Amino acid sequence: RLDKSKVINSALELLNEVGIEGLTTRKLAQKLGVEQPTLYWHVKNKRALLDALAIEMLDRHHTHFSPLEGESWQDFLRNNAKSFRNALLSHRDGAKVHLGTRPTEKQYETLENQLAFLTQQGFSLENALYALSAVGHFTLGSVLEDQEHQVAKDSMPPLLRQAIELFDHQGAEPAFLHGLESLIRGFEVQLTAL
Amino acid sequence: DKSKVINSALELLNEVGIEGLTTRKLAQKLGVEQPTLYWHVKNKRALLDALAIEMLDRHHTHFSPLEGESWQDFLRNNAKSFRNALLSHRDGAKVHLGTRPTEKQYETLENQLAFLTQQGFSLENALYALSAVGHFTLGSVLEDQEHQVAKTTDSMPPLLRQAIELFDHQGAEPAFLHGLESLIRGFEVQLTALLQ
């Protein structure tokens, strides 16, 4: 298994060194000191590699995937999103690596449980689904922006000036927590109306 | 001319996707030698910038409020407009990712912040509201297009089985519309707060 090999740690390191673009099975094979047929025996192509990496990031850094019992659905959602975000930021291009990942048998177990929890709070199955996907889409989107501008990082109009300096002083986390609260609060308003 | 290059580049994108897309492929698609194309597009990053910008010119048409329009309706129409641009071509959302903004887009950002503040939103609330909508929209189309690529419901657990079956029936749009409303309500609640 990849479990008993240094393939994942070696790819994770290469990822940090060159990013998802420069990460190829060829370079990984050279990093490992082996030729390609042997790396192929461990993992078949870059997509299968990224999948494994995505899941390792989740395994290592995605703490709050199911709700603490007694925890409100609002709290579950906040902490789930923060936890997913921490996973995506744990490595370079973590969000791009996640994109296109095939959920595992466990990720379905975990997503059945999440749907069970919200429907118990009076979300229709539809709205539970939409709620988790909106939080997920928002978070993925944020981290993608964030990670693309970690790379980049008067006559000017006041409002634009204020908005730029805002992100220099405060970074991306307040914007993240703000959008997350806008979502959770919007769910409450929507639930109430329906 | 550049119109020929861009239209041909858009076709190639639809044919081969963002990953198959190269300036080499584009040159041998067009009539021309690679150094000829170079003067239109330096490299893949420049090509992708040009395509992202073209999808926005063509389809992202609701970047400023049409006056009379409520801030809510503007935010809706802006987000749907933006989504249309990303969905207009294969891998549009990935093409958009990592494009730097033009001076015009910054000029647009000024106007939008001015507009939302005029409704009573703090600048910080204006700014974070706009990013939330943009980030939600981008993330949606990404996983949507990413899911479109996918080409077993009856083997998986009860609720999830029903949930995904629901997703296939009513495609991706309803989830997007609903999440867009949720952001808008969250914003409205901020609007009615004694202290933003």
Curated annotation (Swiss-Prot), chain A:
Gene3D superfamilies given in the database record: Homeodomain-like, Tetracycline Repressor, domain 2
SUPFAM superfamilies, sorted: Homeodomain-like, Tetracyclin repressor-like, C-terminal domain
Binding site for Mg(2+): 98
Record-level GO BP terms: negative regulation of DNA-templated transcription; response to antibiotic
Any single Pfam family the record assigns to this protein: TetR_N
Residues forming coiled coils: none
Protein residues bound to tetracycline: 62, 80
Regions recorded as binding DNA: 24-43
UniProt cross-references to InterPro entries, sorted A to Z: DNA-bd_HTH_TetR-type_CS, Homeodomain-like_sf, HTH-type_TetR-like_transc_reg, HTH_TetR, Repressor_TetR_C, Tet_transcr_reg_TetR, Tet_transcr_reg_TetR-rel_C_sf
Known function: TetR is the repressor of the tetracycline resistance element; its N-terminal region forms a helix-turn-helix structure and binds DNA. Binding of tetracycline to TetR reduces the repressor affinity for the tetracycline resistance gene (tetA) promoter operator sites.
Protein name per UniProt: Tetracycline repressor protein class B from transposon Tn10
Organism name: Escherichia coli
